[PDB]
Design a protein around this ligand. Structure first.
Ligand SMILES: N[C@@H](CCCC[NH3+])C(=O)O
Ligand SMILES: N[C@@H](CCCC[NH3+])C(=O)O
Ligand SMILES: N[C@@H](CCCC[NH3+])C(=O)O
Ligand SMILES: N[C@@H](CCCC[NH3+])C(=O)O
Lengths: 296, 296, 296, 297
């Protein structure tokens, strides 16, 4: 019943001259380790999994795996895809190269049925013997992993242990944990980190933690120790940055914040992702000032 | 800032031969008082505020005040309307007839602007000197009281002390209490009662409490005493009843349950409200059996 | 099946000193008569049906019926309400006082089921012997009259002859007219007047016609005579005014336009409706200069 | 000024046999469309399961499409979309170099970029090739919407962007588009509302129903383009029930089921996460089909 919980980070993927900055990628992973982060998620939605080639996707799981060798920090590698043969491929690469588990996003664009989602995830789970965390973000995929399908996959496949929820649907998180209380519900939405943890959630996969890993790690651990008045206190402080980090489509605002804080050298994206508007740029710079950003 | 918080019930309005049954109305109020309920909300959305004549709206506030005289139970009278001159009339009647405060639903159908909503509520509050609780349910009104508008009304009109949220948006309730922590956030959605209380909410205006007032009252008091593990446990047990009470439009499922429990004489509505479907009738009867329904 | 179709206007209700300007009302309906309008709709959503008293609602049907006598222009009186006893009351007043038919909006706020909508409209239909036109606006009522419910009411009720659609759902209007081609589909959305008429719709109940009755009247008859390129050309010229007349909630922009054109003396609303933002005021005045506004 | 590909078009299904592309049924399904009045074929779209095909299989079905439409008036508007711009430019350049008459490019999915990103995304695609490029907006599946302003700006700034295949169920947006930019080719991507889009100035459809009933879809489009809206609307009303039942589940699950039930494909095979429909929906597809007479090969 292997799980990966606690404070986790959906790592941004820095670019340098149109190639992956492998130097800076490892240097951002050591900033997360030294600020209380329990696990890192390479190549998620925040890692621009869509514009990376299969070798770049694979190269940044390997960099993640060795950058956390000799630490407690686990690697929950992003291995999702809208094609099952593609998702199994990323899952098999992650196991054979030392990953502690995989995050697998619901298939996007092709909108599979609930029966399709079941067989999609069942094929991935049986491909490996490492933990598998589901990932539901219907605003991005066009499809919903129903509560019944999540619970069925948790009960029918032995390495499927929970779901990364990014739904803004607190009703579904009461639904999930009331009918299946043994599952690990992970928040994928920074604004509601504390409410999800306060209802029995056991971790977060955060975007803000790229910028403020100490604050996000403190929030999760306070909540897991049932210290809910301090957990809510950090969640209230983080609301302004949590919402302005979505003024444009993630990960455009967070990479802007990392550039403004000097944590990445160049504000580079891969198309169709671009730098934000000049107005929103000013709004990112203004919200950052109310927080104390840790350096290297 | 005079407040009305705690476990509250949006009481159903029983009909007999298409006229308001005034004697069963009072007998449901000693069932609520006698099971730990802290306040009652006469003629809300659950009370069919839209289908009562102006005298029946007023007569059911009078019964609530009279039946709660000599007790600790307050009366937060429903006084909302989509016409401001109509809302001021009900608000001043509520004070002049002994109500401790008023609930005021956002104007429906006429979809006012944020400036209109500000002036709408600014006009009501200035009519009375008793607490005024806002009520935001955009799924039924077609308009939403913005987070800024709620906070502005809370800060500018002294008797306006909080809001009954039934938006199903936990992000908005972090938004409200992180920027204005002195406001009384009231849950208007039974399925997510505990998460709203766990984030600093100070009460509920419940539909489920019509049938199980002791459980809903226990949930709120557990949470207000910061016993979040027992509050969540009741919230998880109540999920099935909380959602099956909305398989059809409120208050059709709850009135069906009250009739099945022998607490009201007739499964009677006034059009356009009708008895539920044949199928949903069976679903209410089936979910009720897993709960212990307290009598008179 | 007696019908009321063609180019129709949802009349604005002018106020002076917080009262209904009854003589500016009659002179505004006669501006509509002399510009090709086939029927007038007193006290619709554009007429602020929500803030008028029940006697003021009745007074503006009387003015509408009286002004149209001796004309070929029909009066489709607004008689909808979220309470069936209120809608039947208005329906019987319209028949007994000379209206040619009634418009009845879907019940708002209390969200009846499809079974409730059937009994609601059937009770209204058996109330009178004049044509009854349904009115579907889900953005404001929170409920929708399904295609199946509309078709049943058309087939089961003699005087029920069609539906005013304001959903922005051209799929539903293909659904309606492909399965029941004998019904009169009326456009309730000015921007898509021509597409709805081009698919077999037989009229519009317009907001823009308050300001530009000649263009809406020309558009409808061009389309009804199957002159689709001239109907489409007028619909294309009117797009800019059709959409900016909803930059704020109707009838706030249209009353602003009527005031700017000197067709009403005071830009007065009844709360919670208010005058528009100062920006939208400037942008309405800006779009208006591209059209030739007919006087009295 | 602009080169376009309009008329009655078909979003081709991709038949599978034992987990690979049945290349001989693919060519025989495009050869069924040609003789039934279809003006162009769209290989490997959303209906073609572009997401589960390898890049080498995606390219193989553009090649089959180009060869099968040689000697005929039937054009190839090849599916070349991707959520990665370098991937979309790759598919765009392959299509030109291999004989396609144009490319369809879906709005980037999942990464949901901003309007500025969509502009630069499509400008890179348009400048990679010199053949027409048709935009494709389906927000229900991609999570993003190409605003009216971005479509119009892309139409005016780049030669080969000549229109958009709309699948939004938003007739307001199609009045917005053609009232402010009437020189663009608006293509319906939603079979139920083919006629309303054509009646407002649309100049073609990229159809799913045409996979099963190409003659009816072809007659509908040409009736509408000849401004005979009473026969065009009559066919659109006749086609509504099948137009709706082909989406009881997510496309292309119902359409491939219908093709299998009609004996036009041999195996009801998908690539995961796409699967066979429920037995319940299976029965509802079978029953709506009988009220129509399906042409064979
Ligand atoms: N077009 C694929 C490429 C994924 C490659 C691995 N990250 C997608 O965006 O899903
Ligand atoms: N149908 C009326 C009822 C008013 C009288 C009691 N609230 C309304 O919704 O405003
Ligand atoms: N506020 C009431 C007024 C109804 C009187 C008739 N216009 C309602 O909208 O239901
Ligand atoms: N799964 C990939 C497939 C790309 C190859 C064909 N488009 C995607 O959706 O982008």
């Amino acid at each position: 019943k292997n799980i990966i919980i606690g404070a986790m980070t959906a790592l941004i993927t820095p670019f340098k001259n149109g190639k992956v900055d492998e130097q800076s990628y490892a240097r951002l992973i050591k900033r997360q380790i030294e600020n209380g982060i329990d696990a890192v998620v390479p190549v998620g939605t925040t890692g621009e999994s869509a514009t990376l080639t299969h070798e770049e996707h694979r190269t940044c799981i390997e960099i993640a795996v060795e950058t956390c060798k000799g630490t407690k920090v686990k690697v929950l590698a992003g291995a999702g895809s809208n094609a099952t043969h593609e998702a199994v491929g990323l899952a098999k690469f992650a196991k054979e190269h030392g990953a502690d588990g995989i995050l697998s996003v619901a298939p996007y664009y092709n909108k599979p049925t609930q029966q399709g989602l079941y067989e999609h995830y069942k094929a991935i789970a049986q491909s490996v013997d490492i933990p598998v965390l589901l990932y539901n973000v219907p605003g991005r995929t066009g499809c919903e992993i129903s509560t019944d399908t999540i619970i069925k996959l948790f009960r029918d496949c032995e390495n499927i242990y929970g779901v990364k929820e990014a739904s803004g649907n607190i009703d579904k998180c009461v639904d999930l944990l009331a009918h299946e209380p043994r599952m690990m519900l992970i928040s994928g939405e920074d604004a509601i980190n504390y409410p999800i943890l306060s209802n029995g959630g056991k971790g977060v996969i955060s975007v803000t933690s790229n910028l403020l890993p100490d604050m996000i790690s403190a929030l999760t651990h306070f909540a897991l120790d049932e210290n809910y008045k301090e957990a809510k206190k950090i969640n209230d402080e983080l609301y302004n940055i949590n919402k302005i980090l979505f003024c444009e489509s993630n990960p455009i605002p967070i990479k802007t914040a990392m550039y403004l804080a000097g944590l990445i050298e160049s504000l580079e994206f891969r198309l169709p992702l671009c730098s934000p508007s000049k107005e929103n740029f000013a709004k990112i710079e203004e919200v950052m000032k109310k927080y104390k950003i840790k350096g290297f």
